[PDB]
Structures are given as structure tokens and as C-alpha cells.
Amino acid sequence: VFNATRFASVYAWNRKRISNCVADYSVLYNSASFSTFKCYGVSPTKLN
Amino acid sequence: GAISSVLNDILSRLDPPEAEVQIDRLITGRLQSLQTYVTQQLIRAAEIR
């Protein structure tokens, strides 16, 4: 999703589904792998 | 007018400074629900009296 070799375009964007797995959203909050991180309908600390 | 009618759907979902806004709506609505109930029952207590 985030470490993909190539991203999609906005004229037609792909959609990667994630289901039936143990997620770890530490990549979005703690690890230095982004320029900004903002949530709208949920807290960023409660995602884990 | 809130995001969800349940508290845990906001308390365990939103941050404090934003959850205060949505919780204030439910408290505003649920409180007027009681005032309409108590006002009706307080009138029925006169018809029965």
C-alpha cells in the first residue's frame, strides 16, 4: 500500500483491499515514513 | 446531528477536543427528551388527580 514501487493515477486509481489480518498502524504515527498525517473520522492513536 | 448515537463509538473513536463537540450534541438532545417526558407525565398527574 505505502511501500509500493509505483502508485496509481487520479484519472483512474486502484484500490487495495485489506481484510482478515492483524493490522499495525505504527507506520502512520511513529515511523518516519510520511510528511503529514491527519485523521478525520477517527483518532490516530486508537487505530492500533 | 452527531456522528453516532453511542458514546463508545465516539469516546473510543475521536480525540478529546473533538469528542467534546459530538457528545455535547447527544447530551443536548437526550436532555430535551426527558423534559418532554416529565412535562407530559406532570400533566397526566393532574388529569388523574
C-alpha cell belonging to residue B19:
469528542
C-alpha cell belonging to residue B24:
455535547
* A43/B contact by beta carbon, under 8 A: yes
Q: Where are the alpha helices (DSSP H) in A1-48?
A: 26-29
A30 in Cβ contact with A37 (< 8 Å): no
Method: cryo-EM
Q: Which helix (H) or strand (E) holds B44?
A: helix B16-48
* A13/B contact by beta carbon, under 8 A: no
Burial of A7 (0-12, 13-18, 19+ CB in 10 A): exposed
Q: From residue A46, how far is each of A5, A22, B9, B23 by CA, in Å?
A: 29, 15, 12, 18
B10: which DSSP letter? H
Q: What is the resolution of this structure in A?
A: 3.4
User: For testing the chain A interface, which of B8, B9, B15, B21 should be mutated: the one with the most A CBs within 10 Å?
Assistant: B15
* Cβ–Cβ gap A43/B3 under 8 Å: no
Question: Cα separation of B32 and B40, whole Å?
Answer: 12
Rg over alpha carbons for chain A, rounded to the nearest Å, is 13
Question: Cα separation of B10 and B20, whole Å?
Answer: 9
